[PDB]
Amino acid sequence: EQSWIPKIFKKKTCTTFIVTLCQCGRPRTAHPAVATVWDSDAHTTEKPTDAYGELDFTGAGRKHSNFLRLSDRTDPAAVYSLVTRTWGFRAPNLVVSVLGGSGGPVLQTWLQDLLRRGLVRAAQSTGAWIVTGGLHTGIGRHVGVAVRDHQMASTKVVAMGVAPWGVVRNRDTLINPKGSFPARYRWRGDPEDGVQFPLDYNYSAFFLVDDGTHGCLGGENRFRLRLESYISQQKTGVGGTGIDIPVLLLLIDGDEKMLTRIENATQAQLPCLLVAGSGGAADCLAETLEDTLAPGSGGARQGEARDRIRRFFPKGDLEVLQAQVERIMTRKELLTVYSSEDGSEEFETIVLKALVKACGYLDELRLAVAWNRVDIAQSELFRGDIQWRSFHLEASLMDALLNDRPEFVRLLISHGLSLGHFLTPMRLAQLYSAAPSNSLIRNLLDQAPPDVGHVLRMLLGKMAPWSDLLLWALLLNRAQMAMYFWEMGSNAVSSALGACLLLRVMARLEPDAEEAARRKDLAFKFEGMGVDLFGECYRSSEVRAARLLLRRCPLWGDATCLQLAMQADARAFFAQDGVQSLLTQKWWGDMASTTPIWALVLAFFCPPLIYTRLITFRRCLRRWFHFWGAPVTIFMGNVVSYLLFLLLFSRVLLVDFQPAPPGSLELLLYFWAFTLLCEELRQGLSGSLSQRLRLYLADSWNQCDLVALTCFLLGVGCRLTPGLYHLGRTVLCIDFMVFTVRLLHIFTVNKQLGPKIVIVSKMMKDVFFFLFFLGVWLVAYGVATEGLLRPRDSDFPSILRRVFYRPYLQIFGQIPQEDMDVALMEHSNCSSEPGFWAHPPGAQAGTCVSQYANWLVVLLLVIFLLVANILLVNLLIAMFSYTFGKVQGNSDLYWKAQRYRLIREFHSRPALAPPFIVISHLRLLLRKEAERKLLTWESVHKENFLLARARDKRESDSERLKRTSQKVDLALKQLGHIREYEQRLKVLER
Amino acid sequence: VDIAQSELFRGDIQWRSFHLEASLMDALLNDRPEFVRLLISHGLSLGHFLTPMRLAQLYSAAPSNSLIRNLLDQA
Amino acid sequence: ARARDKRESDSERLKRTSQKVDLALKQLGHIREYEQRLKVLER
Amino acid sequence: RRCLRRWFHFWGAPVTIFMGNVVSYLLFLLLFSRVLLVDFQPAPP
Ligand SMILES: [Ca+2]
């Protein structure tokens, strides 16, 4: 996408030649037919640019170095937009324009060290921009080599080149109005002249300013200054939240023209940093500022003396230099001197103080947040001399939140930053407004002032600053921010489970894919953290408090912790011992969890025994209801009722089922089945009508019960009709099978059998594989045998029998040799067809079979027996063994999870058994400070757990090794210092 | 390698395209990956570097009787 | 990413610490020699 | 025409070709079995 690039940007060709030789820098001969003082704009013609695209320096580089040619009189907004958007460069956190003449190809060692170590390092750390001449000469070359050395030794800095068109060596190769996306640049040009220079190969971007001249210097000064000012007017990301981008000018040596440029920059309110001892045109200003409030007598001509000394003799006589120095001092607040300090190389702090002084609201904390320098912020805060205001830190906190800098927010909060007063509906709206472009949260907010209530309602279903901040972070999916807020939350466990729920639902709702997977991962991390916190809260402290923690219903959604876990499928959460013990206790209701099963049975059959001490736990009726109200006793009663129901069903079906009108027992059976139907109706109805109906029908067991009951009704209806008695009997016969299959549910309660049942459920893929394999083989062998025999019955039912049924039973040791092996049969001439025939003795083995090639029949029999009885069955064994070995853990977790659903289901069933449950359905028809202390105790445990994790991490070997590396680096730094002092003392010895 | 990196990093020393081209050829022939990496990283023009003569030289460095050598001979 | 991960591995960090300690010992020998020279020049 | 384009897309998809081929193969086996077990006679085919 570049079609607009020629549109908004224009190159400059001079309209008029002004003297043989033009002022335009081109020979008189090479000029257009249109050819007192030449003007760079008045006598210039504009046309669409023809030298855009990107460079590919021959050899090294990132294979991408964007280049542009534009007129000097170009608005900077378009340039900034181009760089930020089209070329993909991130907005700058700081712009350092490195002025400087640097006379001579070689620069002093201390200056080169300062550049390479401070300037480039700080630029990389803070993601700043370096603006210099994009030429392999002057200060630009030094900057480029410094950047290259830093990149090599670091184990990518962004620097641009603003250079005049006409002085770029080999400009022709870059000319391509269509486009020069690839671009070969011969920067190793053998000829060397000062009229033109090659482009440095270390600069990521270029700005070949043009002013209709074939060579000159300084033409780009206007554009450079305007660009710097415009960048200074922008903001540091996060919409308008970002502070004004700091822009700083660094000056080393230079000339009078550099003094003029410094004056222009100061006029444009741009801070300037001067290096002491750099050389001419730079150290003079440093000295003058050092003079500052010098005495009027004997100082007025001191400035002139300094000008004539530091500056070159030319123009020294001219008073213009002194007047310009005075004008510069007029705004000395924007000037600073780089204290040499024997090569301090502490660039960032000097820049910070210079920016603060220039500002005279921009604050150190806001700048530190704008950059990623946590150390700067902590140093500034730790400085006791500096005093901070509530809003002073509030602005910084807002910036940190908007830009997602967890470390900064942590540090700011830790420094006594009031939070309750900090958050406001306006600020919260701002925070939510920072949704990244088209994110799912943004779509949800648009579809829905934050107005976050409705989005949460539509997410969950709906069927304290920390809480709000945590919710916002979860919505925006800022992992570290959310984790930190949770660490400061109040309802830690319930908060964690709610976060897991919300993240999982959002992820299933995201078009994010791998980004959604990170939300899924964040959900897993939160679930694990909640698990660990609860495990600590339970084992290490009173279990009663843990029980209270789970049962309570916080304000997250007015739902219990267990409900949240179940809705989020937080399988890991239920897997821990504490939750299982609590669930067991609820399962036994009021009676003790240790009650032996046999004791329970004896109590069940001997109601009076419940009052004996042999079972552990008006008082009498209260105890009675407790016993009969416990979920376990309801379960046992229901099982007994179900068994009696099956017994009655079997009795009726096998004996009393007659064509006559139904008897007493059959009617009792009908009433019983109707009771079961009412029970399932109750379960479905109360367990949003469509939503709960789907929830009920989802459970497989309920599907089984429903199919059983519908088949039962179908069969009864059929039997009542006079004609369909047999059909009714048959349907009821199958319905008995369907009912009795339900008894498998009894093994979902045991501590060992439930996992076995789940694993069996997962074996069905292997079962189907074997079934289809056997089906194919059966079809093959059966058809082959039947074809070879050629029985004369040729009756479709008989054909199907001999093709499938008999081969099938051959798998299970029913091998009728007398019906296939001719040797066991009497030879007879049954059929008129030519050949021989025999007479099988079997009733359904065919009237008579051929015997043409019977040895082949026996051979096929042997092959089939082998493949079926041995190979297929053993393959199935192996597949079962492998699958069972592979899915043990997942099955166990799944059972532990569903244990809660089971318990809840049985916790609300009517107290009575199905056969009498009609009476209970009828009844159903016709119809603090302690909490605060609990939360405080939970928060204390959370703090202990967090400290334990942090300390354990800090004591790990890897962290200790890293810290030792840091200390060794510090030791080497100090060793260099003492070595330098040693050299100084050795010198002073003489 | 350290000697080469020190020599290159020395700003006083100026290098020529062929000046590094000879070194690059030597590094390739002797199979010194670090040297070639460093040389290329130092703004060494590559498109102009390779030539059919140079490529023939490179392929001529097949070690004694190697399968590549047999295949080239057969071709 | 691969290069940085390798450089941040424990083994590489330990090797780099060994290099830095060797450099420290070199400089320590230098300063010790200068210490002896200064002690001599004291008289 | 959009209609024919959609039609060809459906019937051109590899999966649909696979399903069609499977159905054809099953019918072929069924025909084979029928012929072999019933209509296979010494008389001309
Ligand atoms: Ca049910």
UniProtKB/Swiss-Prot annotation, chain C:
Stretches for region Mediates modulation by decavanadate and PIP2-binding: 2-7
Tissues where the protein occurs: Widely expressed with a high expression in intestine and prostate. In brain, it is both expressed in whole cerebral arteries and isolated vascular smooth muscle cells. Prominently expressed in Purkinje fibers. Expressed at higher levels in T-helper 2 (Th2) cells as compared to T-helper 1 (Th1) cells. Expressed in keratocytes.
Post-translational modifications reported in the UniProt record: Phosphorylation by PKC leads to increase the sensitivity to Ca(2+).
Mutagenesis or variant effect for residue 11 to A: Decreases the sensitivity to Ca(2+)
UniProt feature coiled coil, ranges: 1-43
Family to which the UniProt record says this protein belongs: Belongs to the transient receptor (TC 1.A.4) family. LTrpC subfamily. TRPM4 sub-subfamily.
Domain notes: TRPM4, is a temperature-sensitive ion channel, it adopts distinct conformations at different temperatures, markedly influencing where and how ligands interact with it. Decavanadate (a positive modulator), ATP (an inhibitor) and Ca(2+) bind to different locations of TRPM4 at physiological temperatures or at lower temperatures.
Disease: Progressive familial heart block 1B: A cardiac bundle branch disorder characterized by progressive alteration of cardiac conduction through the His-Purkinje system, with a pattern of a right bundle-branch block and/or left anterior hemiblock occurring individually or together. It leads to complete atrio-ventricular block causing syncope and sudden death.
Function: Calcium-activated selective cation channel that mediates membrane depolarization. While it is activated by increase in intracellular Ca(2+), it is impermeable to it. Mediates transport of monovalent cations (Na(+) > K(+) > Cs(+) > Li(+)), leading to depolarize the membrane. It thereby plays a central role in cadiomyocytes, neurons from entorhinal cortex, dorsal root and vomeronasal neurons, endocrine pancreas cells, kidney epithelial cells, cochlea hair cells etc.
Protein name as catalogued: Transient receptor potential cation channel subfamily M member 4
